[PDB]
Design a protein around this ligand. Structure first.
Ligand SMILES: OC[C@H]1O[C@@H](O[C@@H]2[C@@H](O)[C@H](O[C@@H]3[C@@H](O)[C@H](O[C@@H]4[C@@H](O)[C@H](O[C@@H]5[C@@H](O)[C@H](O)O[C@H](CO)[C@H]5O)O[C@H](CO)[C@H]4O)O[C@H](CO)[C@H]3O)O[C@H](CO)[C@H]2O)[C@H](O)[C@@H](O)[C@@H]1O
Ligand SMILES: OC[C@H]1O[C@@H](O[C@@H]2[C@@H](O)[C@H](O[C@@H]3[C@@H](O)[C@H](O[C@@H]4[C@@H](O)[C@H](O)O[C@H](CO)[C@H]4O)O[C@H](CO)[C@H]3O)O[C@H](CO)[C@H]2O)[C@H](O)[C@@H](O)[C@@H]1O
Length: 412
């Protein structure tokens, strides 16, 4: 008659839930709040979560004693009495992932902020190219890629900030448990806390946040994103700190055959405030302001800071190679070759025998210590700290040919 049960807390409310693994079509919950009149409620079935739920208002502060009556076939059964009063990305059972449709992947955006934000305060949006017709599109909750356009910015329901209209392509975590992510080219899953992002869409693309612009509408918004392509060869995706860090993210990919289940991202035990505080202590002086200039919204990548052309540290790599600091940090020009770029960022360039020896990376200056930071505080030391961190398999990148589920957790 097995079941799992629990009490989800959100704001001042407590949602009792009952998930049956048997032949159950109805569930009554019987509860007492600080020993009051016994409430007996026929619970509602939440299809997305595949569980019965009943929300008790303004009771998060209270003591709740509850048990359930449920059927298993014809007869009814009672559970024992439970009492109120993990959230880990690993706690989502693979068995609970719904089968994706049309060669897609089931996507869950999960709230891991430990009470910092509620589900209805975390926003997400998927934008990318639909390979069906090559049209730039956004994902709806039905799993459909809808074409974006300039008109979308002004369509009914559009967003507005300081008198300017922006496409409303975003959803709240509270809007869905799972969404089908169909095949998509250069997709991005934008994530933001407190508000959506404000990004102009066009008939042939969109303009994202410009962290070099003092008046960018997203400068004072805490956001991040995951990148993915879903094609005939399956799911391929990553988190990235190549441009900025907004908040901890974990990215778990699970396959159909049941032999692939991998997760990359910041360690779940790292806190956002922890990371800002450690960043300014751990990195050498030249990299410190990357963590302060646009605090508390983000930590900046070096080329968005004083390592840029004309900046105070525009010659940070000067003695080490003849190749410019800017070429190195962005993997362009004389550092367009991935292995060269990688070795320079890691300070192993002058020792070819060490290019693929992880324990020798970042052992002397000058080096990309911003990139090093993300490796030090990420699962399995994997991170996209700079553009070519995938050299020697060091990036927070995952792929599988038969994807079932992708879980993306917003940490804090
Ligand atoms: O790095 C310095 C420059 O950074 C730029 O901004 C970055 C921006 O370009 C990047 O956008 C991501 C897209 O590049 C990415 O699109 C994917 C392709 O990268 C990729 O091709 C592979 C290729 O990697 C390999 O070499 O050969 C394969 C042969 O087929 C090929 O498949 O193909 C993918 C499959 O189509 C394609 O999706 O998509 C991502 C989203 O999914 C984008 O995030 O993102 C960076 C981080 O945000 C940006 O820094 C600047 O524009 C430049 O000025 C800088 O010099
Ligand atoms: O300046 C150096 C270069 O930096 C480039 O930006 C990279 C960006 O390219 C990288 O995007 C990844 C892709 O690497 C990844 O590609 C997959 C292939 O690796 C695989 O073999 O094929 C599959 C298709 O089946 C591809 O998906 O795909 C993911 C998901 O879309 C992308 O996120 O990510 C880096 C970290 O953000 C980023 O720095 C830039 O694009 C180059 O133009 C530039 O020369």
């Amino acid at each position: 008659a097995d079941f799992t049960q629990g009490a989800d807390v959100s704001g001042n409310n407590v949602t009792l839930w009952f998930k049956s693994s048997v032949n159950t079509t109805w569930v009554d919950v019987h509860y007492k709040v600080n020993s009051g009149v016994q409430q007996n409620v026929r619970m509602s079935f939440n299809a997305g979560a595949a569980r019965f739920e009943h929300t008790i208002l303004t009771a998060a502060q209270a003591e709740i004693e509850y048990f359930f009556t449920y059927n298993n076939g014809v007869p009814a059964y009672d559970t024992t009495t439970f009492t109120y009063r993990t959230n880990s990305i690993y706690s989502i059972p693979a068995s609970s992932i719904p089968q994706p449709s049309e060669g897609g992947v089931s996507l869950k955006v999960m709230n891991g902020t430990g009470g910092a934000y509620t589900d209805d305060q975390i926003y997400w949006g998927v934008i990318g190219i639909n390979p069906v017709n090559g049209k730039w599109s956004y994902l709806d909750l039905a799993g459909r890629l809808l074409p974006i356009s300039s008109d979308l910015n002004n369509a009914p329901g559009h967003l507005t900030k300081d008198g300017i209209n922006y496409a409303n392509i975003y959803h709240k975590i509270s809007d869905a448990n799972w969404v089908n992510l169909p095949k998509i080219e250069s997709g991005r899953l934008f994530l933001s806390v407190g508000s959506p992002l404000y990004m102009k869409t066009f008939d042939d693309g969109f303009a994202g946040p410009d962290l070099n612009n003092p008046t960018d509408p997203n400068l004072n918004i805490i956001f991040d994103f995951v990148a993915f392509t879903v094609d005939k060869d399956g799911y391929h995706g990553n988190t990235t700190r190549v441009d900025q860090f907004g908040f901890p993210i974990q990215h778990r990919l699970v396959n159909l055959a049941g032999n692939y289940d991998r997760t990359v991202g910041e360690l779940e035990s790292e806190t956002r405030s922890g990371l800002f505080a450690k960043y300014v202590n751990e990195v050498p002086y030249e990299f410190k302001s990357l963590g302060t200039l646009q605090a508390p919204y983000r930590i900046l990548s070096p080329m968005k800071g004083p390592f840029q052309e004309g900046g105070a540290y525009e010659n940070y790599f000067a003695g080490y190679s003849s190749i410019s600091t800017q070429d190195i940090l962005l993997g362009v020009g004389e550092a367009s070759n991935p292995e060269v770029c990688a070795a320079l960022n890691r300070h192993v360039y002058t020792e070819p025998d060490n290019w693929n020896r992880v324990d020798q990376y970042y052992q002397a200056a000058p080096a990309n210590y911003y990139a090093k930071f993300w490796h030090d505080h990420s699962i399995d030391g994997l991170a996209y700290g700079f553009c070519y961190d995938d050299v020697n398999g060091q990036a927070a990148y995952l792929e599988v040919g038969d994807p079932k589920g992708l879980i993306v957790r917003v940490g804090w």
